[PDB]
Amino acid sequence: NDRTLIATQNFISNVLGKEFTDPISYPIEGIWQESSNMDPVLFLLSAGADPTSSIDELAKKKKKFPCEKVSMGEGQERVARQVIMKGFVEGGWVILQNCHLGLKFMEEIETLVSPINQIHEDFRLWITCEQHPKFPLGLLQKTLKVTNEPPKGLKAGLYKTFTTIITQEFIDKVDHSNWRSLIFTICFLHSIVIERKKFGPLGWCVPYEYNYSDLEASLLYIEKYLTNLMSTPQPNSHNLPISMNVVRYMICEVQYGGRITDDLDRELFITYGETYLKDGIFGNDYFFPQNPSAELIKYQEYIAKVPTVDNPEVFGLHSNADLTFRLKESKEMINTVMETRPREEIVQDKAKDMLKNLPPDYNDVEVRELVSKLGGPNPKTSTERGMTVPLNIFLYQEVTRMQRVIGLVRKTLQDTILAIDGQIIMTPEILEAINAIYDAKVPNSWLYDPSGAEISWLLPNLGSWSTSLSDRNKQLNDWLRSGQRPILFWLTGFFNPQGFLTGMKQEVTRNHKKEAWSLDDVVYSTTVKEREKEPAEGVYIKGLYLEGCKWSKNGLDDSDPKKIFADLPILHVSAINKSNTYLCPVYKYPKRTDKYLIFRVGLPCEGSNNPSHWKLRGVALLCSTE
Amino acid sequence: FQFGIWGKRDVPCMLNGLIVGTILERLEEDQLQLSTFNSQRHVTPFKAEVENLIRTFSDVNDTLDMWVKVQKLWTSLEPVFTGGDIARQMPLQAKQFQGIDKNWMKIMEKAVETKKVIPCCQNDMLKDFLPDLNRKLEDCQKMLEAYLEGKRKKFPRFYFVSNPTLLKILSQGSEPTSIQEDFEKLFDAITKVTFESAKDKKNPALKQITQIQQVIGRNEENISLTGYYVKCEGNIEDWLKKLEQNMQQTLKDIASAAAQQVFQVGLKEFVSSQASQIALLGLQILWTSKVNEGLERLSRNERNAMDIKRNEIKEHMNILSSMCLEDLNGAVERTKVETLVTIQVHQKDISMDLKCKDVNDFEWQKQTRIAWKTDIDECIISITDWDSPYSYEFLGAKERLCITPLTDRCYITLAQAMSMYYGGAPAGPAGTGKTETVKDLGRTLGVFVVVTNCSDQHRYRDMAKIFKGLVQSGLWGCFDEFNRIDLEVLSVVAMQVESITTARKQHMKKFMFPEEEIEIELIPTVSYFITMNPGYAGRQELPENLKVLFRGVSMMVPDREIIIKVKLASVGYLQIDLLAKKFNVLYRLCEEQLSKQRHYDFGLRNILSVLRTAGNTKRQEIKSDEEMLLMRSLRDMNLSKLVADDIPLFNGLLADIFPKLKEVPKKLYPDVEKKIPEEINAESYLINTPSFQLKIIQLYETCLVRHGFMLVGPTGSGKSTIMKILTEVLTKLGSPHKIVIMNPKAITAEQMYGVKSEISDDWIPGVFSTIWAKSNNRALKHTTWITCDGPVDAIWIENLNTVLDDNKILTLANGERIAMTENCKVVFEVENLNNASPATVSRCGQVYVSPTDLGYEAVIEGWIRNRKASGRAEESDKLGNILRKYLINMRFIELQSKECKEPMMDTSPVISVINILNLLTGCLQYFVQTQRTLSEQEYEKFIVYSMAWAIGGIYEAQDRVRFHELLLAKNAPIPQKGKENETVFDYYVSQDYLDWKICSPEEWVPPQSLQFSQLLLPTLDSFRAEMLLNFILTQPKSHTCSNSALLIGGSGTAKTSSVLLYCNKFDPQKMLFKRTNFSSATSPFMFQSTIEAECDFKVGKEFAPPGNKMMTIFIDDMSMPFVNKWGDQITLELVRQLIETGGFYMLDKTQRGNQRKMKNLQYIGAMNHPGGGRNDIPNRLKRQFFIFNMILPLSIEGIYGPIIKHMFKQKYFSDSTYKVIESLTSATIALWNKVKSTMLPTPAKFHYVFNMRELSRIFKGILTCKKDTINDAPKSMKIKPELFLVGLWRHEAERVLADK
Ligand SMILES: Nc1ncnc2c1ncn2[C@@H]1O[C@H](COP(=O)(O)OP(=O)(O)OP(=O)(O)O)[C@@H](O)[C@H]1O
Ligand SMILES: Nc1ncnc2c1ncn2[C@@H]1O[C@H](COP(=O)(O)OP(=O)(O)O)[C@@H](O)[C@H]1O
Ligand SMILES: Nc1ncnc2c1ncn2[C@@H]1O[C@H](COP(=O)(O)OP(=O)(O)O)[C@@H](O)[C@H]1O
């Protein structure tokens, strides 16, 4: 199923002809020839794309006047109507906007655009809207529909960009050497960083809507910089005397810095700047991906020789990335067409049998006892005690939240089954719970709250969710009932991992070098236990997962096995002061946001590949695997 | 009777009372005194006199109020119709105003004739005229808007002013007086201006302005002279415009001088001589010029002169830091100095590492440099490339802020965006310095910024008004919380802003604005900003037309170390760098590894609060080590919010960072701590405990520091009492204090802040804003504390961000902006936050009450103190001698000692204690009445009886027998005389003697045969219900008694039956009754309507002869109203403000800030076994109602016996059919049992529901044919007389059961 889609293109080319599987791009000047005066032009747009500037540009090119514009909203019907009447008598152009709200005026338009009420020639109408059903099809049945989401392929977006700001940006130079190369650099950067998002959370934590606005912003800056640099240049040594490090900072943090909500993306984007700009215009070198000559149609040909489908090592990113993308892509595609084809039963009994399998509650009158009875960092160092030792208070907090969830689950399973077999006036929440129990997804009652109460959100009803909760409670109980500190802690189970680590810090400060060591003086570090087969200060973590290399002697991953185990990364803390190293994050879930960043780990294992290689490769040490 | 006349400029004279504050206030405590007297027992005679007196006083008030309001309307409209052209151009309402002038003059002359305002108000004709005149004057204003728009056009700033206040501004009637109270909301910082009369020949002397003043606090101020003067004239726009211009010009010239003086005189002289703004400019220009000179001197050859200039700055640092910081006079002068100090700290920090070879180097081309050009005399501020001239606005001393690198990122970004003609729209989480960063870039560039506050109740017309003002003037706008706004409004705003962007792009002097036909001009130095907040509840998206304009600035994590260290430098500390790390690490650790509670906050607002606190402590004489002072400050600040458990963790964490220090005492304030027990003893029912000392003092401190605060904590915990007692102690030592209350979800937010009317196209006033305007007047003596009280839902609260932020300005969709004063504070008596984003958690301080602060036992001792007040013979001692051990060591052995696992109403047990106390008082009321004192044993029996119910009222028979066995095991005697399988509940204690008996009296029916006429019979359940009810309902409004009751029973378990049995027994000659029912979509306005129609009078202002009898409000089911999505239902809150306090706010489109009063009412309710599908009532409300179960009867063979007896004794022909008839009475029951048990409801047959109603319907069908059944003779179709009867039984049972 990985290579479904190209095969799809293939037999389509066979049974229907290869002409179908070939690019199309709509010449807006060509499209204008279709629009008679008596039919409008609709526009089903997507986020981060608008043809309004191009429509205006054409209206200045062929037509000689600026169009008039009315934005839909509230209290704009009569305004729209009177401007349309002016257009009717005269023959101007009108730009409606935001029809996705304020639909009451739409039905009127079909009556207006009629043969009865006569209209002066050369009058066009341009409509724009968005995905709102309950949109009567009077005009959908009679209009011209056009889509202007940005192009897919790398060459596609590159070519389009090479038909946005062209032939007078390009042709106005007074220098074929330097800033021609700067245009080419920035354009390639644009087209690469936009397309990086195709992979998913590996490439970008969330989606960002870069468009051309940032581009011509940067172009306006750098043209000012070069014009006022060379304004004092009476003679060019070799075409320029620029010190291009400021431009790095600008294109890094100011122009494109607007969208960026994450921290890691900042230095990731700086790295892309480093590797692509090179900190110099070589003039003679091979881009990692060719390099140009100085003529326009030559740029068009340069685009022509670019391959259609590329491989992700162009971005620096590993081949295996490809795999996951295709799978999810295939997984949705068939489902689309799968739609076009022409409960209160033993499932609740299955849940009924389930609820007599999750464990019993832990009454606090017992638990407070048990936690107070036994506790210490080291049996020799201290006698049993409760509050004072950080790990015991952590034990109590974790048991508290666990019980808070256990009670809710037991109660709602009961009251879900006690409506039919039992009796109560049916609730809507309980009905939602029934539907969720039949499907794979757990009800919202166990994940979220009106603000947010994330607990253990995993996919299956019981395959992993209750499995995970059971494992958490098992380890927590054996961490309590015996009361002894086991080796190989499971970090995923703890609701608040960070408290674990800071408690370890406090433990080291108190037990050792106490006072010789202050809390604010201590800093953090880690040594990876490079060993299969095996206390001192620090902890032993079990269950981390790496992505994309080995533990030590890190190398390229094979085609399968994208997610790999993580060995025992024993910790270390030291008083402060008492660039070959690479620093990795640790994300709880594989969603990869600013939240869930528990801590950062230095991983020196380099060999020949400098760390920036790894930084663009987007390694990370996530915790769960989903 | 002293009154202030406007003038004699016509035949008549129009006047107002400028002493009326004294009138109102002394009136208020007059009526307080009169009610205080009347309530007391020994006030027999005064009733004839006093009521009449109060009545007159009450009545005169509202008449006066209406009158003076109309006067203000007229006092706005007079100058409008003096001008010839406008009077000509609209003759109709001009002559209507001639008519009102005639009528108004007649009223004034009648008042003049009277000479005394009280007979003047007593006139009855007046009252009809006044509101009709009011409405007509509203119509006149609705004529005058068409001229208001043009007058606004003639001068920019009026766009940031609302309509009626603009009218008042335009009706000056005087040079000095009228505008002297309005300079604040028309310029940035000016508040006072002198007026010097120049006597022109033959013209009256014209007042002219000569200097300007910025006042902060009371006496501290900044004065600015003027060489160029400004003269008043005939046209208000003229002298306002001249004020602006001449200000700009003199500011320019003083700066032009000051730039020479800076390098001539030397540091100290010009910093001391000049004002703050010019001083900061001088420092910046000196540094840039000297650093430049050093850089070129490096360029010539290797030189030390650059190092000499850097050393000169370093030398300047010590002289500024040593003297001007530690000792100084006055607040304004104080703020100036550290404003210089922070800049200089950052200055030297940059200059240390400033390794740039020449001016062209980027490291030099990264900061906000300045150059005051001489050859063309003008300022010019410079950034990387952008440049712009200083805008010359007098601001005086403002507390500008530190410069972290992130602020540099913002500065560079915003300069670039403004160079490309856009508007920055920064974003991030709450409290990272967005709005203040914008405001500071405004302040440094010399411009004046205008923050507003969008909200869902906005409309595009007002945004257009704003933007027109922005383009006309040259000012900057910062639309805080721009996202929380309607979608289509954003759709049209997209157009407006795009039009202005294209206009500015061409550099075109004149341009066209959409929707507005007249052509309008532009000034370049404008800008737009929206500080939107990504992602909450009630937050929409920007349609893609609008994302084009603004450039993003991502402000996620502010710096926290550098700001702290430079602030500590600014105060003048010596242990800077260590302490900074201490602050940061402590607040971090506290954030992560402490328990998760919704209300905790450790953001930058808390930190800055600590810093602005910490200034004074070092300013005190002590030279003790700084770290001690700092530990004390941090610990004592952050204690208040923490719940019980987190306190040990918090101070154990403190010990790990300051191990050198062991302990310090808390600085204790002696006056208040000695004062508190005095009034705690002054009351009857108040027990002092140490926890109260701690919490009330903590409240005092957080009051002292911050704007507003919250009292989070569970029910019955003493919050309102704490507020009351605090207000008392503050008032005792002078400095009075007043408190107002409000309930936000018992009124609709549209009414709370007012909207534009949705019928007549005209504004209505808002309640909360009316209280705001009435409160923040200067020249008062109170210190008002507006109390909101309810839940915290985000939708209504969150549009008070500006008032609770450092802006402390209220902003409306009207266009009205009201400035906060220090006279006023905002408080919330809310239970707990569960629907609050951090943007509202971090804005205000907070204090947490805990359940164990005031145990129920202390409340019992307070009641005991009351018993030793009058009935002090021995009763307090005797009663309690059982109570203490009988309550402390018993109550917790009922919750789950024995099973008791069906407490239908989950509660906290303090409510049970309030309940049993209220019951016991009514129990002993009879022997209080006869003045008889009893032995100990009878009292023990009474307590057993009292608390049997009121803890036994929430349980079923099985739990009740287990309860009973407990009481047998370890309690005082219950009935033992027979106890033949009968519980303790069955019997009652008799007043006449110590006995445990019970019965239901015999009573049959009247002769009528209607099923209603067979209304109800005397059951056992009904009689015991009356027994319990009557005790509470006789008690006369004791504290902790609302005189309100509430039953609990299944749907069809004799609710309205027993209640109506009670209600018939009323005496309508001194006791009335009213009925109401509840459904899901019953709204607060509906309940408001029914209660207003019930009373029909405002019984607060000495009214309602017919409501003087006592009334009762009965409600069947308080559960059914629709719970909101959050979980907080919005109907019961009106009831809760009715029970707790009586009365509410009016909504009659005429007056807002005022409340009707209920001086007498009664209340009763009934529940339906809450749990599962049945809703529940708000827990805050559970504290007031008596709650107990209403079980099924288990005796239904004996309810219907009589009606069959009375039917039976007509024929007398039933030799054997009588026994049969009784068997029918029992066999219907057998059938009922079998069918009800066997066949059930499922969601496909949900309505398969059975109760006792159908038995009544069966009998109702049977009871017919008083003798027609006998007439079997016509048919006799093998029919005995009984056969027809059993056939009737069969058909009946089929049609009542075998149908649905
Ligand atoms: N010093 C005191 N001594 C004895 N009893 C007290 C004292 N202070 C308060 N109480 C009692 O405590 C109760 C005060 O409850 P309060 O009205 O303060 O609840 P609250 O905290 O305001 O919450 P809510 O407003 O939801 O009731 C009253 O019953 C009062 O009699
Ligand atoms: N760099 C800074 N220097 C001084 N104070 C700052 C700084 N950044 C933030 N603050 C403080 O934060 C508060 C402003 O927060 P604000 O920007 O209003 O939050 P929001 O942007 O969510 O409205 C002020 O008390 C301000 O002094
Ligand atoms: N004491 C009584 N005498 C005669 N009929 C009674 C008596 N008590 C209850 N009933 C009958 O039982 C029914 C109980 O209905 P009711 O209590 O009004 O419903 P709900 O409990 O929902 O208020 C009544 O309709 C009434 O006819």
Which backbone phi and psi does B618 adopt, to 5 degrees? -65, -35
**Separation CA B318–CA B313 (nearest Å):** 9
- Asked if A226 and A239 count as a contact pair (C-beta separation under 8 A), the reply is no
Dihedral of alpha carbons B628, B632, B633, B635, sign: positive
**Helix (H, G, I), strand (E, B), or coil: what is residue B427?**
strand
Joined together, the tokens standing for residue B321 give: 């830091």
- Asked if B944 and B963 count as a contact pair (C-beta separation under 8 A), the reply is no
B238 to A12, B29, B235, B776, B779: CA distances (angstroms): 79, 48, 6, 31, 31
Alpha helix ranges (H) inside B324-372 = 331-353
B109 to B3, B106, B136, B1096, B1238: CA distances (angstroms): 15, 5, 22, 36, 86
Dihedral of alpha carbons B499, B501, B505, B507, sign: positive
Q: Is A69 on the interface with B (CB under 8 A)?
A: yes
**Separation CA B520–CA B506 (nearest Å):** 15
**Separation CA A85–CA A70 (nearest Å):** 13
CA Rg value for chain B: 39
Mutate to test the pocket of ligand 3, among B1000, B1057, B1232 (most ligand atoms within 8 A of CB): B1057
**What secondary structure letter does DSSP report for A315?**
G
Chain A residues with beta carbon closer than 8 angstroms to that of B543: 98
Among B445, B446, B470, B451, CA closest to B526: B470
Say which amino acid occupies B204. P
- Asked if A424 and A415 count as a contact pair (C-beta separation under 8 A), the reply is yes
Chain A residues with beta carbon closer than 8 angstroms to that of B593: 390, 496, 498-499, 502-503
Alpha helix ranges (H) inside A35-76 = 52-61
Q: Which residue's alpha carbon is at the smallest distance from atom 24 of ligand 1?
A: B715
| 389-408 of A, contacting B, C-beta below 8 A | 390, 393, 397
CB contact under 8 A, A393 and B552: no
Q: What is the largest CA-CA distance in chain B?
A: 142
B173: left (phi over 0), alpha (psi -120 to 50) or beta: left
B918 to A287, B715, B936: CA distances (angstroms): 89, 18, 20
Cα–Cα–Cα angle for B815, B821, B822, rounded to 5 degrees: 155
Q: Which residue's alpha carbon is at the smallest distance from atom 4 of ligand 2?
A: B401
Beta bridge partners of B1216: none
| 536-555 of A, contacting B, C-beta below 8 A | none
Q: Which one of B487, B657, B835 has the shortest CB-CB distance to A520? A: B657
Q: Which one of A101, A390, A427 has the shortest CB-CB distance to B488? A: A101
| 335-364 of B, contacting A, C-beta below 8 A | 362
Residues 6 or more apart in contact with residue B1022 via CB below 8 angstroms: B1000, B1016, B1054, B1057, B1058, B1061
- Asked if A526 and A599 count as a contact pair (C-beta separation under 8 A), the reply is no
Chain B residues with beta carbon closer than 8 angstroms to that of A248: none
**Separation CA B389–CA B525 (nearest Å):** 9
Mutate to test the pocket of ligand 3, among B1020, B1051, B1252 (most ligand atoms within 8 A of CB): B1252
Joined together, the tokens standing for residue B1083 give: 């709204």
**Separation CA A29–CA B607 (nearest Å):** 60
**Separation CA B731–CA B515 (nearest Å):** 56
- Asked if B855 and B717 count as a contact pair (C-beta separation under 8 A), the reply is no
Residues 6 or more apart in contact with residue B560 via CB below 8 angstroms: B583, B584, B587, B604, B607
Is B1256 touching ligand 3 by the criterion CB < 6 Å?
yes
**Separation CA B395–CA B185 (nearest Å):** 14
- Asked if A129 and A97 count as a contact pair (C-beta separation under 8 A), the reply is no
* Distance between start and end Cα atoms, chain A: 20
- H or E element at residue B845: strand B845-848
Q: Which among A519, A576, A597 is the top mutation candidate for probing chain B, defined by the most B β-carbons within 10 Å of its own β-carbon?
A: A519
**Separation CA B244–CA B251 (nearest Å):** 11
- Asked if A180 and A173 count as a contact pair (C-beta separation under 8 A), the reply is yes
Q: Is B308 on the interface with A (CB under 8 A)?
A: no
B1112 to A209, B1075, B1094, B1290: CA distances (angstroms): 64, 9, 10, 44
CB contact under 8 A, B362 and A245: yes
Among B40, B51, B375, CA closest to B1099: B51
- Asked if B846 and B713 count as a contact pair (C-beta separation under 8 A), the reply is no
Chain B residues with beta carbon closer than 8 angstroms to that of A424: 1172-1173
Is B1059 touching ligand 3 by the criterion CB < 6 Å?
no
B12 to B101, B102, B265, B733, B1215: CA distances (angstroms): 11, 11, 63, 48, 100
Joined together, the tokens standing for residue B7 give: 């003038």
CB contact under 8 A, A425 and B1173: yes
- Asked if B927 and B1212 count as a contact pair (C-beta separation under 8 A), the reply is no
Q: Which one of A71, A102, A387 has the shortest CB-CB distance to B494? A: A71
- Asked if B671 and B733 count as a contact pair (C-beta separation under 8 A), the reply is yes
- H or E element at residue B1254: helix B1253-1262
- H or E element at residue B388: strand B387-388
- H or E element at residue B16: strand B15-16
Residues 6 or more apart in contact with residue B867 via CB below 8 angstroms: B875, B876, B879
A281: left (phi over 0), alpha (psi -120 to 50) or beta: beta
CB contact under 8 A, A506 and B656: yes
Å resolution of this model? 38.0
**Separation CA B897–CA B1017 (nearest Å):** 40
Q: Which residue's alpha carbon is at the smallest distance from atom 7 of ligand 1?
A: B686
Is B407 touching ligand 2 by the criterion CB < 6 Å?
yes
Chain B residues with beta carbon closer than 8 angstroms to that of A71: 491-492, 494-495, 545
**Separation CA B899–CA B960 (nearest Å):** 11
From the DSSP assignment, how many helices (H) and strands (E) are in chain B? Answer: 44, 32
B485–chain A nearest CA distance, Å: 13
**Separation CA A364–CA B1223 (nearest Å):** 57
**Separation CA A162–CA B325 (nearest Å):** 62
Q: Is A506 on the interface with B (CB under 8 A)?
A: yes
Among B693, B739, B700, B743, CA closest to B720: B739
Residues 6 or more apart in contact with residue B510 via CB below 8 angstroms: B519, B520, B521, B522
Residue B472: count of CB within 10 angstroms of its CB: 19
* Distance between start and end Cα atoms, chain B: 79
**Separation CA B56–CA B62 (nearest Å):** 11
Chain A residues with beta carbon closer than 8 angstroms to that of B834: 450-451
Dihedral of alpha carbons B1201, B1204, B1206, B1210, sign: negative
Say which amino acid occupies B123. N
Alpha helix ranges (H) inside B1065-1107 = 1084-1095
Among B726, B717, B719, B737, CA closest to B673: B726
CA of B1133 to the centre of ligand 1 (A): 19
Residues 6 or more apart in contact with residue B1236 via CB below 8 angstroms: B1250
Residues 6 or more apart in contact with residue A224 via CB below 8 angstroms: B385
Q: Is A121 on the interface with B (CB under 8 A)?
A: no
Is B1013 touching ligand 3 by the criterion CB < 6 Å?
no
- Asked if B950 and B1188 count as a contact pair (C-beta separation under 8 A), the reply is yes
Mutate to test the pocket of ligand 1, among B696, B859, B866, B1133 (most ligand atoms within 8 A of CB): B859
For the CA of B567, the closest atom of ligand 2 is 4
Say which amino acid occupies A499. G
Q: Which one of B409, B556, B1242 has the shortest CB-CB distance to A420? A: B1242
- Asked if A588 and A349 count as a contact pair (C-beta separation under 8 A), the reply is no
Say which amino acid occupies B1268. D
Residues 6 or more apart in contact with residue B681 via CB below 8 angstroms: B688
Chain B residues with beta carbon closer than 8 angstroms to that of A213: 548
Beta bridge partners of B1187: B1046
Is B440 touching ligand 2 by the criterion CB < 6 Å?
no
**Separation CA B740–CA B787 (nearest Å):** 6
Among B319, B1132, B1146, CA closest to B791: B1132
Among B399, B343, B802, B406, CA closest to B608: B399
For the CA of B605, the closest atom of ligand 2 is 25
Say which amino acid occupies A586. V
Say which amino acid occupies B1192. L
Among A289, A96, A102, A101, CA closest to A189: A289
Residues 6 or more apart in contact with residue A462 via CB below 8 angstroms: A354
- Asked if A584 and A601 count as a contact pair (C-beta separation under 8 A), the reply is yes
**Separation CA B21–CA B602 (nearest Å):** 44
| DSSP track, B131-155 | HHHHHHHHHHHHHHHHHHHHHHHTS
Burial (0-12, 13-18, 19+ Cβ within 10 Å), B1089:
exposed
Structure-token match 């005399």, residue found: B377
Residues 6 or more apart in contact with residue A444 via CB below 8 angstroms: A432, A436
Structure-token match 């709509």, residue found: A26
Joined together, the tokens standing for residue B228 give: 């160029």
**Separation CA A132–CA B449 (nearest Å):** 39
Q: Is A499 on the interface with B (CB under 8 A)?
A: yes
Alpha helix ranges (H) inside A355-427 = 364-373, 390-417
Is B1199 touching ligand 3 by the criterion CB < 6 Å?
yes
Q: Which among B491, B627, B897, B1117 is the top mutation candidate for probing chain A, defined by the most A β-carbons within 10 Å of its own β-carbon?
A: B491
Among B1263, B1287, B1289, CA closest to B1275: B1287
**Separation CA B1127–CA B990 (nearest Å):** 45
Structure-token match 């003045």, residue found: B931
Joined together, the tokens standing for residue A89 give: 């008598």
**Helix (H, G, I), strand (E, B), or coil: what is residue B102?**
helix
**Separation CA A594–CA A587 (nearest Å):** 9
Mutate to test the pocket of ligand 2, among B452, B604, B811 (most ligand atoms within 8 A of CB): B604
B365–chain A nearest CA distance, Å: 10
Among B726, B839, B842, CA closest to B787: B726
The length of chain A in residues reads 626
